[PDB]
Amino acid sequence: FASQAVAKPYFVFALILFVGQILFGLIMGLQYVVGDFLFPAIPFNVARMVHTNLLIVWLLFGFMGAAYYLVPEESDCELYSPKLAWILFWVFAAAGVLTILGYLLVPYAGLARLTGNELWPTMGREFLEQPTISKAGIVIVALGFLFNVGMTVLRGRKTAISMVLMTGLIGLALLFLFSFYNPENLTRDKFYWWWVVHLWVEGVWELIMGAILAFVLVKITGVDREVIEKWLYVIIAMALISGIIGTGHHYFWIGVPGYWLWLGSVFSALEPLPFFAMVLFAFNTINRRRRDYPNRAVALWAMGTTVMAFLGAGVWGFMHTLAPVNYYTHGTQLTAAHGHMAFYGAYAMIVMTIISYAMPRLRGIGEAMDNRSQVLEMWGFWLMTVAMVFITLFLSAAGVLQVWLQRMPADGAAMTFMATQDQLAIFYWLREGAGVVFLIGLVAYLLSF
Amino acid sequence: FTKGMARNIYFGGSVFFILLFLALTYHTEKTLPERTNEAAMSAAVVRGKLVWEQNNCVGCHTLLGEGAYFAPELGNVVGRRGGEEGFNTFLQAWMKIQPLNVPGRRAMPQFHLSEGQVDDLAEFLKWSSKIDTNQWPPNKEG
């Protein structure tokens, strides 16, 4: 279907913003260990919100990309409005670049003032640093998009893949509405903040990832749709059965009642399951396949994702998910460690996977690329992937050492925040290194076409 | 084991836990007034939650263990700067002297906040510190 071509802009742009995100990472990396680097011009918290919003925005572009591509195939339909795809691409990307420039160009408090955050205050919350108008923008883009891709689904075929992806995206935009709801009570604020961050990332974002993976597995393997979709439903069933009440692992220390310590730990300990079942999913169905796919990079991606997600979200989420363990680890370098490997493993990777599959045919080059462009892509893969595992390694080390020096000893025995940061210095340096190996890795990947 | 029993475990398993979750959030949202001491949550503290948000403290600090990991945990900073009685006065000085300009050291912005704003900010943080976080953090250091 010739209106799958509206996915290209979203994919290209996602990769553009991804280069940004990394660059702003490397800045923060350096700031850790050279405390005045880029100060006052670009303070740490500014570099952070840029690093942080680009990650989320670019993934959202990848997601709309993926949806625009795979949905018409699944519905056996032309995409409802290929123009509205193209116009909603400019609204989103405009509002994207604009809000990123808001951050860099005006002192944050000024940006709150400038954008009239006075009237309807939503700013200065983690991952939610975008002004209230910036958010409004993202909802209209999201509603046009849901309608657009949803109409396509409604006429023509329902497939499990279709429905799940849809349920995922509806769930994403809906929960994003809570980012307009900012209680004056700190705990109430925190309670609801997780309805966005966690129910996205261990909730509805898992259906988006499952369905995308499940689609790619259908095409590159040729294994029966009946079996793929059956597996899919198992994956998401496990995701939500553990995930929903699993929100509780963010509910330990914010001042909601103690029974969450129990509820949160137990339900979280099962949260690795979906990801492990996604490993088995990809390995088993790449294992018994009808065809030999001319693009061997997709199969790499597909596997690396389930593995990385599992390690990052699964294993690393598990290390600190238990209340008596998280009590000491909460808000430390452990957290940044887990945060990185899970975001990269499940989401960056799933996105790069679908781009690996669909970009070649999206440009009219065919099923795959010249064997010269494939070997770069896998050099790209491995570098990023391996750089990231090192990143999270270094950070876990910094983390344990932090919990050791800071959290464990008694008053007077425990090191102060700044003091213990000084001890972590070498890990912070090695992490910059690893970050450089990662940028180089991204560039490699981008040059593979 | 068909696609159907899978799809149904998905539906019912899901719709069950969403209801169980709303039920628990209702129960929890009744608990807060006493847990967080909302009666003592004054206009000052609420006006301070604003200063905290407008300036993105969270972009370098953690509050009750959530935020950035670049600078100290502020949920319990009160206990590190001459306690309850003297904290507002400290914070006034603290905010005015930034950035400290020690070479190589992580630096804090000058936010140019009025005396009034820093006073609300101080009430915010004092209030925050007296929330029942089930005994978090482990010690005086956050």
Epitope: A413, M415, T416, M418, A419, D422 | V102, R105, E141
Partner: antibody, heavy 124, light 108 residues
Framework: EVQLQQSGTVLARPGASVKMSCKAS????????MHWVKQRPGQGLEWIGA????????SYNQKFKGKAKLTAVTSASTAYMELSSLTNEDSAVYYC?????????????????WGQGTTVTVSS | DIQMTQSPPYLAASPGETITINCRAS??????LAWYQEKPGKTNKLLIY???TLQFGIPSRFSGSGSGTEFTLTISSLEPEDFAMYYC?????????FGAGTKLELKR
């Protein structure tokens, strides 16, 4: 309240050793450089050196490199200074003081709290 | 080493007045100078650091400025407890070094 408790007066013969202590309380002892300053009457203060109980590192003024030895015992939040080959020049008041900022990298800063001083009298 | 000269070495004044004292560095210490107050039977008290920053708890009647090699301490309106010994310390380089003092005597 951040407090430093120093040991009492010591008398010694020329060429002997003495070892004085500085007992810290009310802060994280392993997080702050502990500094030692010498004062002889109408002579003005001179910085002897510093220990960092955090990792046990030390830093000496060349003027004192051989004369003084600094150490710390974490468990007891106390730092210690040893003076050797005592001469008359060494008769003086000796202070410990805490760096006013925390961490290993601020080695040369100012101090926010001082001990009351330990008098060393060297005499035959 | 960088060496520090304080001037005057002593100075008389009366409660209510304003005095200003001097501290010169043998070479540039940039902005990093601190001052301490010494009183009998009290531990030494940090007043200002980095040239101009009041340390917590110190009355604002105290203030200080300077950069490079020349610095001053000023007391706006003298108070009985201000008559004391005042030392400056350079916090720019290893090894740390002090001025030899200024004695601020109560005039009668």
């Amino acid at each position: 309240e951040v407090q430093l408790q120093q040991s009492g007066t010591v008398l010694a013969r020329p060429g002997a050793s003495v070892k004085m202590s500085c007992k810290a309380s009310g802060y994280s002892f392993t997080s702050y450089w502990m500094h030692w300053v010498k004062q002889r009457p109408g002579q003005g203060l001179e910085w002897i050196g510093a220990v960092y109980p955090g990792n046990s590192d030390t830093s000496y003024n060349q003027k004192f490199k051989g004369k003084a030895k600094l150490t710390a015992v974490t468990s007891a939040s106390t730092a210690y200074m040893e003076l050797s080959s005592l001469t008359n020049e060494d008769s003086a008041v000796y202070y410990c003081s805490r760096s006013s900022l925390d961490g290993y990298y601020v080695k040369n800063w100012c101090f926010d709290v001082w001990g009351q001083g330990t008098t060393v009298t060297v005499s035959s | 080493d960088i060496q520090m000269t304080q001037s005057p070495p002593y100075l008389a004044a009366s409660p209510g007045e304003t005095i200003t004292i001097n501290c010169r560095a043998s070479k540039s210490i940039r902005k990093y100078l601190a001052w301490y107050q010494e009183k009998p039977g009290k531990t030494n008290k940090l007043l200002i650091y980095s040239g101009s920053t009041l340390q917590f708890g110190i009355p604002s009647r105290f203030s200080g400025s300077g950069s490079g090699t020349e610095f001053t301490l000023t007391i706006s309106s003298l108070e009985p407890e201000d008559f004391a010994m005042y030392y400056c310390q350079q916090h720019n380089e290893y090894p740390l070094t002090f001025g030899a003092g200024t004695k601020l005597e109560l005039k009668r």
